[PDB]
Swiss-Prot record, chains A, B:
Keywords annotated in UniProt: Cytoplasm, Pyridoxine biosynthesis, Transferase
Family matches, as InterPro entries: Aldolase_TIM (IPR013785), PyrdxlP_synth_PdxJ (IPR004569), Pyridoxine-5'_phos_synth (IPR036130)
Associated pathway: Cofactor biosynthesis; pyridoxine 5'-phosphate biosynthesis; pyridoxine 5'-phosphate from D-erythrose 4-phosphate: step 5/5
Binding site for 1-deoxy-D-xylulose 5-phosphate: D10, H11, R45, H50, T100
EC code(s) of this entry: 2.6.99.2
SUPFAM superfamilies the record matches: Pyridoxine 5'-phosphate synthase
Gene expressing this chain: pdxJ
Family of this protein: Belongs to the PNP synthase family.
Name the record gives this protein: Pyridoxine 5'-phosphate synthase
A molecular-function term among this protein's GO annotations: pyridoxine 5'-phosphate synthase activity
GO BP terms, alphabetized: pyridoxine biosynthetic process
Record-marked site positions (Transition state stabilizer): E149
Coiled coil: none
One cellular component term from this protein's GO annotations in UniProt: cytosol
Length: 259, 259
């Protein structure tokens, strides 16, 4: 039935950290997400590139919304999650040791199982951010994750390449400078694979989310995958907000994911 | 009479460069500034942190608006200005050799005079971004600048410290952790000095602009300085746009600078 929208506010913090004058104010933005979205997502990186520990504290203390903290396996941020107790933690990679070549979390990491254990023991829901592969979905089930989040980045880039002007710009991805026929086949395959992976997740009793790189154009085929129950989207919504304001950017996305 | 508003779009490019997917699209934003603002400002840094050479090219070729390029004294960007011919160039410092301790351009720089010469010879209007000091205003007149832009940053920080919550946040400036009485006196002095400097500029036949750090609160005392004819504002407008959209953020600022 109805898809849930988590709004990742990281790129609002990107703007804020750029000038260091507390503007835009992330707690202000969070209040808007709280009202118009279904969950507030933020990634508190070890390197503190954007969202900060005080943002997580303030949002948990002040906002009427589930909170989805994205974080890696470092003790500092896991300890903070254990102390502050967001509703959900989505484990994402930061360090080489946590990363796979495609960007999903390495499910063989020596600390992953105990990390999941500690969070679940604290009654925090755990999602694993994973490459869309059937093998990783099975591994996630074995690790006792409730939730998985499929990495839509490669799908998103392929969609951008095929259906937008990006290849004509300075932002073109050299990897995707290929004939269109090949790209079309890769896109179809990647989209088919997303659907198969969502089906597998649901078959194993996992809840399936998606959302990295999703924008107001490439989201549409993803909405048609019935087995994905949630999307976490940030950068494209922040990018739209510059034109329409954050409330309207969220509401526009909500309208697209109706089904 | 009527204050002109230049909108600096650099922080829209900050968002764009953060994810490298051409979103937000700077040319889209420029069209909005073209319509609702009085000039489009952008700073093409040698290090290409945000606004890029292609942005300057595209805006000059596609937008119905005066363009104010901010740039430093490096040959690469000066040559680009000479080739593309924005309406105005505002010379700002980037390198240690160009910088003063307060952030204004060093008016003793060995290449400044010839740089001004080349630009004016190409029929490009030249503004110098300067600390608000009477000595620098006189030096700017001697250098044959048409325009000066007073560095309002220190004024802005003092206003933020006195009239907002910034001192209670992670963004508090350690330099301004001082008793309020001292800060109030510094603020009054800095504002008085801005007015005196604008008066001097006008007395010498210069056109006087201002605008760094200006926001929807600290702008108000600056509007009361009759001798400032133009404000160039970026970061606060981009920060407001996340909430209201860029058109509305510009129009709100235009309403504040009515007098």
């Amino acid at each position: 039935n109805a898809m849930l929208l988590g709004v990742n506010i990281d790129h609002i913090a990107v703007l804020r950290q750029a000038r260091m004058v507390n503007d835009p104010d992330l707690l202000e933005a969070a209040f808007i997400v709280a009202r118009h979205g279904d969950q507030i997502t933020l990634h508190v990186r070890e390197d503190r590139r954007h969202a900060q520990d005080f943002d997580l504290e303030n949002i948990i203390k002040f906002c009427k919304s589930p909170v989805n903290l994205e974080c890696a396996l470092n003790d500092e941020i896991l300890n903070l999650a254990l102390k502050l107790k967001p509703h959900r933690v989505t484990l994402v990679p930061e360090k080489r040791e946590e990363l796979t070549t495609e960007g999903g979390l390495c499910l063989n990491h020596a600390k992953l199982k105990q990390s999941i254990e500690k969070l679940q023991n604290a009654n925090i829901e755990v999602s694993l951010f994973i490459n869309p592969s059937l093998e990783d979905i099975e591994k996630s089930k074995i690790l006792k994750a409730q939730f998985i989040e499929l990495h839509t980045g490669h799908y998103a880039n392929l969609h951008n390449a095929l259906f937008s002007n990006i290849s004509h710009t300075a932002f073109a991805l050299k990897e995707l400078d290929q004939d269109k026929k090949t790209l079309q086949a890769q896109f179809e395959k990647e989209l088919q694979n997303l659907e198969l992976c969502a089906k597998k997740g649901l078959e194993l009793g996992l809840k399936v989310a998606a959302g990295h790189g999703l924008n107001y154009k490439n989201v549409k085929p993803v909405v048609k995958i019935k087995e994905i129950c949630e999307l976490n989207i940030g950068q494209s919504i922040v990018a739209r907000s510059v034109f329409t304001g954050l409330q309207n950017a969220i509401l526009e996305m909500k309208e697209l994911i109706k089904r």
